[PDB]
Short mmCIF file of C-alpha atoms and ligand atoms in Angstrom, two decimals:
data_model
loop_
_atom_site.label_atom_id
_atom_site.label_comp_id
_atom_site.label_asym_id
_atom_site.label_seq_id
_atom_site.Cartn_x
_atom_site.Cartn_y
_atom_site.Cartn_z
CA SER A 1 -4.61 -11.12 5.43
CA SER A 2 -8.03 -11.54 3.90
CA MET A 3 -11.64 -12.20 5.11
CA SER A 4 -15.16 -12.09 3.85
CA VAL A 5 -18.68 -12.27 5.41
CA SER A 6 -22.37 -11.59 4.51
CA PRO A 7 -24.46 -8.77 6.03
CA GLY A 8 -26.09 -9.74 9.24
CA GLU A 9 -23.21 -11.92 10.42
CA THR A 10 -20.44 -12.06 12.96
CA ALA A 11 -16.69 -11.46 12.45
CA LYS A 12 -13.83 -12.67 14.75
CA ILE A 13 -10.35 -11.22 14.27
CA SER A 14 -6.92 -12.07 15.82
CA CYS A 15 -3.83 -9.84 15.99
CA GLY A 16 -0.25 -10.19 16.87
CA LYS A 17 1.58 -12.83 18.80
CA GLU A 18 0.85 -14.28 22.20
CA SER A 19 1.43 -12.18 25.52
CA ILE A 20 4.52 -12.45 27.93
CA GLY A 21 3.65 -9.62 30.39
CA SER A 22 0.57 -7.57 31.14
CA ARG A 23 -0.95 -5.70 28.11
CA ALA A 24 -2.53 -2.51 26.92
CA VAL A 25 -3.96 -2.84 23.37
CA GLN A 26 -5.46 -0.23 20.91
CA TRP A 27 -7.52 -1.02 17.71
CA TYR A 28 -7.78 1.09 14.47
CA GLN A 29 -10.10 1.02 11.38
CA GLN A 30 -9.22 2.45 7.84
CA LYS A 31 -11.53 2.81 4.81
CA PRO A 32 -10.53 3.53 1.16
CA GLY A 33 -9.09 7.11 0.89
CA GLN A 34 -9.06 7.89 4.61
CA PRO A 35 -6.85 8.26 7.66
CA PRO A 36 -7.17 5.54 10.40
CA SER A 37 -9.74 6.13 13.12
CA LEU A 38 -9.84 4.81 16.70
CA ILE A 39 -12.27 2.14 17.87
CA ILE A 40 -11.00 0.41 21.04
CA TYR A 41 -8.35 1.48 23.69
CA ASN A 42 -7.01 0.00 27.03
CA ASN A 43 -8.01 -3.57 25.73
CA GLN A 44 -11.85 -3.27 26.02
CA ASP A 45 -12.88 0.39 26.40
CA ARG A 46 -14.97 2.27 23.74
CA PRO A 47 -14.58 5.89 22.86
CA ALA A 48 -17.81 7.87 22.53
CA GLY A 49 -19.49 7.64 19.07
CA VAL A 50 -18.43 4.05 18.30
CA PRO A 51 -21.44 1.62 17.91
CA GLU A 52 -21.94 -1.12 20.46
CA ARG A 53 -21.51 -3.90 17.87
CA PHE A 54 -17.74 -3.51 18.26
CA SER A 55 -16.10 -5.33 21.30
CA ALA A 56 -12.76 -6.73 22.30
CA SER A 57 -11.04 -8.98 24.82
CA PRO A 58 -9.73 -7.89 28.25
CA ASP A 59 -6.31 -8.83 29.54
CA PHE A 60 -6.41 -11.68 32.16
CA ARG A 61 -3.15 -13.74 31.95
CA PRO A 62 -0.03 -14.49 29.85
CA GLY A 63 -0.16 -16.77 26.83
CA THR A 64 -3.27 -15.23 25.02
CA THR A 65 -4.03 -13.41 21.82
CA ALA A 66 -5.82 -10.00 21.29
CA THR A 67 -9.32 -10.51 19.51
CA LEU A 68 -11.93 -8.13 18.15
CA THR A 69 -15.61 -8.91 17.40
CA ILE A 70 -18.29 -7.33 15.24
CA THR A 71 -21.90 -8.50 15.60
CA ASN A 72 -24.60 -7.82 13.04
CA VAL A 73 -22.23 -6.71 10.30
CA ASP A 74 -23.26 -3.72 8.09
CA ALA A 75 -21.87 -2.83 4.64
CA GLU A 76 -20.08 0.23 6.05
CA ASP A 77 -17.84 -2.05 8.07
CA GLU A 78 -15.80 -2.87 4.97
CA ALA A 79 -12.16 -1.69 5.85
CA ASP A 80 -8.67 -2.57 6.98
CA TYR A 81 -8.21 -3.28 10.83
CA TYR A 82 -4.97 -2.73 12.80
CA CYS A 83 -3.85 -3.13 16.41
CA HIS A 84 -1.04 -1.36 18.36
CA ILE A 85 0.50 -3.37 21.38
CA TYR A 86 2.29 -2.33 24.57
CA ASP A 87 3.66 -5.26 26.74
CA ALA A 88 5.46 -4.87 30.10
CA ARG A 89 7.94 -7.55 29.22
CA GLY A 90 8.39 -7.39 25.46
CA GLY A 91 8.55 -3.59 25.07
CA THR A 92 7.04 -0.96 22.77
CA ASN A 93 6.20 -1.55 19.13
CA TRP A 94 6.55 1.26 16.63
CA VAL A 95 4.70 -0.33 13.70
CA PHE A 96 0.90 -1.33 13.80
CA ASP A 97 0.30 -5.12 13.64
CA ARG A 98 -2.07 -6.52 11.00
CA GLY A 99 -5.64 -7.92 11.59
CA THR A 100 -7.18 -8.34 8.13
CA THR A 101 -8.61 -6.84 4.95
CA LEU A 102 -12.37 -7.25 5.42
CA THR A 103 -14.91 -7.51 2.58
CA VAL A 104 -18.77 -7.42 3.07
CA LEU A 105 -20.07 -9.30 0.00
CA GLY A 106 -22.68 -7.71 -2.29
CA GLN A 107 -21.99 -9.93 -5.35
CA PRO A 108 -21.13 -13.49 -6.47
CA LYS A 109 -17.45 -14.49 -6.22
CA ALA A 110 -15.36 -14.31 -9.40
CA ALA A 111 -12.00 -15.96 -10.43
CA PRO A 112 -9.21 -13.81 -12.15
CA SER A 113 -8.49 -13.70 -15.83
CA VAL A 114 -4.78 -13.98 -16.62
CA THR A 115 -2.60 -13.25 -19.65
CA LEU A 116 1.20 -13.68 -20.05
CA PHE A 117 3.53 -12.15 -22.65
CA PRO A 118 7.12 -13.20 -23.63
CA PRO A 119 9.79 -10.50 -24.42
CA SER A 120 9.79 -9.02 -27.91
CA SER A 121 12.67 -9.36 -30.39
CA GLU A 122 12.90 -5.57 -30.47
CA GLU A 123 13.73 -5.50 -26.78
CA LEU A 124 16.19 -8.35 -27.19
CA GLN A 125 18.20 -6.38 -29.75
CA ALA A 126 18.55 -3.73 -27.06
CA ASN A 127 20.11 -6.28 -24.74
CA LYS A 128 17.12 -6.49 -22.34
CA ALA A 129 14.37 -8.85 -21.43
CA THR A 130 11.04 -8.52 -19.59
CA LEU A 131 8.06 -10.84 -18.80
CA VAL A 132 4.62 -9.29 -18.20
CA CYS A 133 1.70 -10.85 -16.23
CA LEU A 134 -1.66 -9.07 -16.37
CA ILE A 135 -4.51 -9.92 -14.04
CA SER A 136 -8.15 -8.64 -14.44
CA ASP A 137 -11.81 -9.04 -13.20
CA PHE A 138 -11.59 -10.73 -9.68
CA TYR A 139 -13.78 -10.40 -6.70
CA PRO A 140 -13.13 -9.94 -3.84
CA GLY A 141 -9.96 -7.76 -4.30
CA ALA A 142 -7.02 -9.82 -3.02
CA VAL A 143 -4.62 -12.24 -4.67
CA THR A 144 -0.96 -13.45 -4.41
CA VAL A 145 1.54 -14.06 -7.23
CA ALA A 146 4.49 -16.39 -7.62
CA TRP A 147 7.10 -16.87 -10.35
CA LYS A 148 8.73 -20.24 -11.27
CA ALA A 149 11.55 -21.39 -13.75
CA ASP A 150 11.38 -24.84 -15.13
CA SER A 151 10.31 -26.07 -11.67
CA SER A 152 12.10 -23.81 -9.31
CA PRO A 153 11.19 -20.71 -7.34
CA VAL A 154 12.55 -17.28 -8.40
CA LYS A 155 11.99 -14.36 -5.95
CA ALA A 156 14.79 -12.14 -7.05
CA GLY A 157 14.03 -9.46 -9.72
CA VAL A 158 10.20 -9.09 -9.34
CA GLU A 159 7.86 -6.09 -8.93
CA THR A 160 4.12 -6.35 -8.35
CA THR A 161 1.45 -3.55 -7.92
CA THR A 162 -1.44 -3.25 -5.40
CA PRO A 163 -5.08 -4.18 -6.47
CA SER A 164 -7.12 -1.29 -8.09
CA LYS A 165 -10.77 -0.79 -8.59
CA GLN A 166 -12.29 -1.25 -12.12
CA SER A 167 -15.49 0.59 -13.14
CA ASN A 168 -17.65 -2.52 -12.54
CA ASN A 169 -16.51 -3.00 -8.94
CA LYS A 170 -13.93 -5.72 -9.73
CA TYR A 171 -10.19 -5.57 -9.30
CA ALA A 172 -6.94 -5.61 -11.38
CA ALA A 173 -3.13 -5.96 -10.93
CA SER A 174 0.23 -6.50 -12.49
CA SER A 175 3.55 -8.30 -12.13
CA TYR A 176 6.93 -7.93 -13.96
CA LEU A 177 10.07 -10.19 -14.13
CA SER A 178 13.44 -8.83 -15.30
CA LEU A 179 15.93 -11.04 -17.23
CA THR A 180 19.25 -11.01 -19.02
CA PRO A 181 19.01 -12.47 -22.68
CA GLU A 182 21.33 -15.29 -21.65
CA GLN A 183 18.97 -16.20 -18.72
CA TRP A 184 15.94 -16.19 -20.91
CA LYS A 185 17.58 -18.78 -23.25
CA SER A 186 19.22 -21.11 -20.75
CA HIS A 187 15.93 -22.39 -19.21
CA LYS A 188 13.13 -24.54 -20.69
CA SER A 189 10.05 -22.63 -19.52
CA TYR A 190 8.78 -19.83 -17.29
CA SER A 191 5.45 -19.74 -15.35
CA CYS A 192 3.28 -17.07 -13.56
CA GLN A 193 1.16 -18.65 -10.76
CA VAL A 194 -1.84 -16.74 -9.29
CA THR A 195 -3.80 -17.69 -6.22
CA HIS A 196 -7.11 -16.13 -5.32
CA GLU A 197 -8.78 -17.94 -2.43
CA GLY A 198 -6.91 -21.12 -2.05
CA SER A 199 -7.31 -21.78 -5.69
CA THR A 200 -4.53 -21.44 -8.26
CA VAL A 201 -4.19 -20.43 -11.98
CA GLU A 202 -1.03 -20.86 -14.01
CA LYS A 203 0.32 -19.66 -17.45
CA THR A 204 3.61 -20.66 -19.13
CA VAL A 205 5.87 -19.48 -21.95
CA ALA A 206 8.81 -20.83 -23.86
CA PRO A 207 11.76 -19.37 -26.00
CA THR A 208 10.66 -21.46 -28.97
CA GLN B 1 -14.39 21.34 17.36
CA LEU B 2 -10.68 20.13 17.03
CA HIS B 3 -9.39 20.12 13.39
CA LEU B 4 -5.90 19.44 11.85
CA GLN B 5 -4.23 20.19 8.49
CA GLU B 6 -0.86 19.14 7.05
CA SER B 7 1.29 20.98 4.35
CA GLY B 8 4.41 20.02 2.36
CA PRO B 9 6.52 20.41 -0.81
CA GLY B 10 5.50 17.47 -2.90
CA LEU B 11 8.53 16.32 -4.84
CA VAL B 12 12.04 16.62 -3.31
CA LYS B 13 15.37 16.03 -5.07
CA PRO B 14 17.82 14.87 -2.40
CA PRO B 15 20.68 16.96 -1.70
CA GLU B 16 17.93 18.76 0.03
CA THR B 17 15.82 17.98 3.03
CA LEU B 18 12.16 17.59 4.04
CA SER B 19 10.20 20.26 5.93
CA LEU B 20 6.51 19.73 6.97
CA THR B 21 3.89 21.80 8.91
CA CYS B 22 0.60 21.14 10.67
CA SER B 23 -2.01 23.76 11.44
CA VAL B 24 -4.14 23.28 14.62
CA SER B 25 -7.58 24.91 15.19
CA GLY B 26 -9.63 24.63 18.34
CA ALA B 27 -6.91 24.28 21.04
CA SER B 28 -3.52 25.71 22.09
CA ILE B 29 -0.40 23.78 21.23
CA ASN B 30 0.64 23.70 24.88
CA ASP B 31 -2.51 21.79 26.05
CA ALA B 32 -1.39 18.32 24.62
CA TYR B 33 0.95 15.67 23.27
CA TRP B 34 1.37 15.71 19.37
CA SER B 35 2.33 12.79 17.04
CA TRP B 36 3.49 12.22 13.47
CA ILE B 37 2.71 8.85 11.52
CA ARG B 38 3.77 7.63 8.05
CA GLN B 39 2.40 5.00 5.48
CA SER B 40 3.49 3.53 2.15
CA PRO B 41 0.73 2.13 -0.23
CA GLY B 42 -0.12 -1.45 0.77
CA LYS B 43 1.99 -1.27 3.91
CA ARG B 44 1.39 -0.96 7.66
CA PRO B 45 1.15 2.41 9.50
CA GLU B 46 4.54 3.40 11.13
CA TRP B 47 4.90 5.67 14.23
CA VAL B 48 7.56 8.47 13.97
CA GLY B 49 7.56 10.21 17.44
CA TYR B 50 5.84 12.69 19.88
CA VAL B 51 6.44 16.16 21.48
CA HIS B 52 5.41 18.01 24.62
CA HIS B 53 6.46 21.52 25.50
CA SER B 54 7.59 20.20 28.94
CA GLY B 55 10.30 18.31 26.99
CA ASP B 56 9.01 14.81 27.41
CA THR B 57 9.83 13.84 23.78
CA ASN B 58 11.06 10.57 22.04
CA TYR B 59 11.68 9.27 18.60
CA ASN B 60 11.49 5.88 16.73
CA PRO B 61 14.87 4.06 16.77
CA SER B 62 14.51 3.46 13.00
CA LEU B 63 15.17 7.10 12.11
CA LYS B 64 16.07 8.70 15.46
CA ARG B 65 19.28 10.52 14.29
CA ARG B 66 17.88 12.53 11.31
CA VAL B 67 14.41 13.66 12.57
CA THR B 68 13.32 16.45 14.95
CA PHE B 69 10.02 18.24 15.97
CA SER B 70 9.45 21.77 17.27
CA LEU B 71 6.61 24.10 18.33
CA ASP B 72 5.70 27.67 17.32
CA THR B 73 3.31 29.61 19.63
CA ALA B 74 2.61 32.67 17.41
CA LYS B 75 1.48 30.47 14.50
CA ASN B 76 0.01 27.70 16.67
CA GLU B 77 1.83 25.15 14.50
CA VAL B 78 3.65 21.79 14.89
CA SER B 79 6.62 21.08 12.54
CA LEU B 80 8.77 18.15 11.25
CA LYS B 81 12.23 18.07 9.89
CA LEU B 82 14.16 15.12 8.27
CA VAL B 83 17.69 15.10 6.62
CA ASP B 84 19.89 12.50 4.72
CA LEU B 85 16.86 11.42 2.53
CA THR B 86 16.79 8.40 0.28
CA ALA B 87 13.85 7.05 -1.82
CA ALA B 88 12.54 4.91 1.07
CA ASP B 89 11.34 8.11 2.75
CA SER B 90 8.59 8.42 0.17
CA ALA B 91 5.18 8.29 1.90
CA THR B 92 1.94 9.95 3.07
CA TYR B 93 2.53 11.98 6.31
CA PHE B 94 -0.20 12.29 9.04
CA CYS B 95 -0.28 14.56 12.16
CA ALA B 96 -2.35 13.65 15.28
CA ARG B 97 -3.22 14.44 18.94
CA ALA B 98 -1.86 11.80 21.41
CA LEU B 99 -3.85 11.18 24.63
CA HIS B 100 -2.04 9.26 27.45
CA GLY B 101 -2.95 6.56 30.13
CA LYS B 102 -1.40 4.34 32.87
CA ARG B 103 -1.75 0.49 33.05
CA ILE B 104 -1.42 -0.53 36.73
CA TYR B 105 -1.03 -4.30 37.38
CA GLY B 106 0.50 -4.37 40.85
CA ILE B 107 1.97 -2.27 43.59
CA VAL B 108 2.83 1.33 42.36
CA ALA B 109 5.84 1.80 44.70
CA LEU B 110 7.56 -1.25 43.11
CA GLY B 111 7.21 0.22 39.67
CA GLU B 112 4.53 -2.22 38.58
CA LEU B 113 3.00 0.04 35.94
CA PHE B 114 3.75 1.74 32.55
CA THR B 115 2.65 4.64 30.29
CA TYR B 116 0.90 4.14 26.89
CA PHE B 117 -0.39 6.48 24.16
CA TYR B 118 -3.57 6.35 21.92
CA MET B 119 -4.53 8.66 18.92
CA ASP B 120 -8.09 10.12 18.71
CA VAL B 121 -8.02 12.94 16.08
CA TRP B 122 -6.05 12.97 12.74
CA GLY B 123 -5.45 15.14 9.71
CA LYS B 124 -6.00 14.01 6.03
CA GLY B 125 -2.22 13.69 5.44
CA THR B 126 0.14 15.02 2.78
CA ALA B 127 1.78 12.99 -0.05
CA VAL B 128 5.63 13.13 -0.32
CA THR B 129 7.96 11.58 -3.08
CA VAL B 130 11.68 11.38 -2.95
CA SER B 131 13.69 10.98 -6.23
CA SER B 132 17.22 11.59 -7.41
CA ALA B 133 16.48 11.07 -11.11
CA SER B 134 16.37 13.37 -14.17
CA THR B 135 13.36 13.76 -16.54
CA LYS B 136 13.27 11.16 -19.41
CA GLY B 137 10.83 10.01 -22.04
CA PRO B 138 9.58 6.38 -22.52
CA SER B 139 10.60 3.51 -24.88
CA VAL B 140 7.65 1.71 -26.49
CA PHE B 141 7.51 -2.03 -27.35
CA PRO B 142 4.87 -4.19 -28.95
CA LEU B 143 3.14 -7.20 -27.22
CA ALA B 144 2.28 -9.33 -30.19
CA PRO B 145 -0.79 -11.77 -30.29
CA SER B 146 -0.39 -15.43 -31.09
CA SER B 147 -1.69 -17.19 -34.24
CA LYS B 148 -2.86 -20.23 -32.47
CA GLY B 152 -12.38 -18.58 -26.81
CA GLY B 153 -12.19 -17.20 -30.38
CA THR B 154 -10.32 -14.17 -29.14
CA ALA B 155 -6.85 -12.72 -29.03
CA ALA B 156 -5.04 -10.24 -26.72
CA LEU B 157 -2.46 -7.59 -27.78
CA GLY B 158 -0.77 -4.30 -26.54
CA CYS B 159 2.01 -1.90 -25.50
CA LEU B 160 4.69 -2.05 -22.98
CA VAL B 161 5.52 1.64 -22.01
CA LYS B 162 9.10 1.52 -20.48
CA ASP B 163 11.50 3.58 -18.27
CA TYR B 164 10.06 7.15 -17.95
CA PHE B 165 10.01 10.09 -15.49
CA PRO B 166 8.13 11.57 -13.93
CA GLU B 167 4.41 10.69 -13.87
CA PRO B 168 1.87 10.93 -15.57
CA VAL B 169 1.46 9.29 -19.01
CA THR B 170 -1.75 9.11 -21.17
CA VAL B 171 -2.46 6.15 -23.46
CA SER B 172 -5.11 5.67 -26.16
CA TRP B 173 -6.01 3.29 -29.15
CA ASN B 174 -6.53 4.08 -32.88
CA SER B 175 -6.82 7.80 -32.00
CA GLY B 176 -9.46 7.14 -29.47
CA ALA B 177 -11.85 5.30 -31.92
CA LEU B 178 -11.50 2.04 -29.93
CA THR B 179 -12.69 2.43 -26.42
CA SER B 180 -13.90 -1.00 -25.63
CA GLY B 181 -11.98 -4.10 -24.51
CA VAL B 182 -9.17 -1.90 -23.40
CA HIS B 183 -7.52 -2.28 -19.94
CA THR B 184 -4.88 0.35 -19.09
CA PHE B 185 -2.96 -0.63 -15.90
CA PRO B 186 -1.21 1.67 -13.29
CA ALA B 187 2.63 1.67 -12.98
CA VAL B 188 5.41 -0.07 -11.08
CA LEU B 189 8.58 1.71 -9.76
CA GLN B 190 11.94 -0.09 -10.41
CA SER B 191 15.13 0.01 -8.39
CA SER B 192 16.43 2.09 -11.21
CA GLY B 193 14.25 5.10 -10.49
CA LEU B 194 11.98 5.18 -13.57
CA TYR B 195 8.37 3.96 -14.09
CA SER B 196 6.72 1.41 -16.48
CA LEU B 197 3.13 0.51 -17.36
CA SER B 198 1.18 -1.46 -19.89
CA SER B 199 -2.09 -1.23 -22.01
CA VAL B 200 -4.02 -4.25 -23.50
CA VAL B 201 -7.08 -4.94 -25.90
CA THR B 202 -8.85 -8.27 -26.61
CA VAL B 203 -10.11 -8.64 -30.10
CA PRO B 204 -12.02 -11.04 -32.41
CA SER B 205 -9.31 -13.31 -33.81
CA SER B 206 -11.20 -13.58 -37.23
CA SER B 207 -10.04 -10.01 -38.20
CA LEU B 208 -6.23 -10.01 -37.73
CA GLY B 209 -5.73 -10.07 -41.43
CA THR B 210 -7.97 -7.17 -42.26
CA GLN B 211 -7.46 -4.79 -39.30
CA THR B 212 -4.90 -2.42 -38.00
CA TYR B 213 -4.25 -1.50 -34.39
CA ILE B 214 -2.11 1.51 -33.20
CA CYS B 215 -1.57 2.79 -29.72
CA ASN B 216 -0.91 6.44 -29.06
CA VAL B 217 1.28 7.48 -26.15
CA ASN B 218 1.69 11.09 -24.83
CA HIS B 219 4.18 12.22 -22.05
CA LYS B 220 3.78 15.97 -21.35
CA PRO B 221 6.74 16.52 -18.98
CA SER B 222 9.29 15.69 -21.68
CA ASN B 223 7.24 17.10 -24.62
CA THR B 224 7.20 13.57 -26.31
CA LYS B 225 4.49 11.81 -28.41
CA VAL B 226 4.73 8.31 -29.84
CA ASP B 227 2.66 6.22 -32.36
CA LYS B 228 3.26 2.43 -32.70
CA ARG B 229 1.54 -0.27 -34.90
CA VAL B 230 1.05 -3.74 -33.29
CA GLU B 231 1.23 -6.75 -35.69
CA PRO B 232 0.70 -10.59 -35.65
CA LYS B 233 3.76 -12.87 -36.07
ZN1 ZN C 1 4.23 -8.44 15.97
ZN1 ZN C 2 0.03 -21.32 21.02
ZN1 ZN C 3 -7.00 -3.56 31.76
ZN1 ZN C 4 6.45 -1.32 27.55
ZN1 ZN C 5 -11.32 -17.54 -6.78
ZN1 ZN C 6 -7.27 -10.18 -20.59
ZN1 ZN C 7 19.23 -21.79 -13.11
ZN1 ZN C 8 3.85 22.75 31.57
ZN1 ZN C 9 2.49 11.43 32.15
ZN1 ZN C 10 -12.28 -5.70 -20.44
ZN1 ZN C 11 11.94 -2.67 -5.59
ZN1 ZN C 12 -1.45 10.60 -32.80
#
């Protein structure tokens, strides 16, 4: 989940599904290279040390969603946010639910550069095949990646890395697709489709 | 002045089992509830369990049969133990202090209440990898540029090796510019794979040579490969 705002502004974040019974909710913040730290407990209470710009919603009735608010956003608010839910009727969760990845902008936005390589004849003699999709220079640091054959979805046989930070504060990533030589020959094209922020880029290769 | 610190083995080859410790400083281990938590890169934090010296202890249903905690008074130390390991046990392991509260929403005598935990102090965590593979050097293939911006892109696919790390350079380090070397993926096989790319002036592909240099210390292997237009 991804979100961006400018310094000085206000962020609103939802988490988890709607309530069934009475609730007790905890919120957690996590910066790059750090363990999580605690910011709200018991729905609306604030541990000592935590600034007053952070606040959350009390539990009043069934049918509602947990929500967190940050007023006057500072650059040091850039982080991942998680919640942990206890519900009298739905039971105890053992995994934290997701809020969002939050970026506090200091630069213009930038679309990804993408390059796509067919499998070499060297590799084909070895009875193997691999497609390689390389993605560089995007900001902010989140994208999704989809593979397509002729005009059909793929899904099975894909591996994709997390984003990582280049030395000019932009991001990069990679995706791979594994094929049998017979599969590579028995279709007409293959595509790699990359989505940044509701916009999509696409590259395509052929056996010929 | 409460402070926590984890310790572990690092790499584990699995007929063996995992054993972790946590040092506590600024309180006695009998004064509180203690928790362990784990997290894979890109994924959501996962709650393992909690212990009290009274014996009010419970474990996550996901791995309840293979994990146990214990307490050692003389060392002032919390410990974790897991058996039957596969490669999905690979993670970063955190220890923490768990405070507790009660949520009361009706008449107590009718059991209209419940217990909840929240975590206020954590350690920096320890990284654990599980693998059943044997050391193996990489195969190296060329990613050829096309003949058809004014620029072309070319590189090296560095395939099926173990374990990390690997260093990669171009033309014996005399070409430092335009190069993107990407971090690796882990296949269902058990071995790694990464790639390195350079973008170049396409009006020089008939006069210039490009060669990547790969080095894999754990197998004592070095490779040099020349990449060419087709
Ligand atoms: Zn959920
Ligand atoms: Zn609804
Ligand atoms: Zn309440
Ligand atoms: Zn419950
Ligand atoms: Zn974009
Ligand atoms: Zn490129
Ligand atoms: Zn088909
Ligand atoms: Zn006691
Ligand atoms: Zn109690
Ligand atoms: Zn570059
Ligand atoms: Zn996989
Ligand atoms: Zn050399």
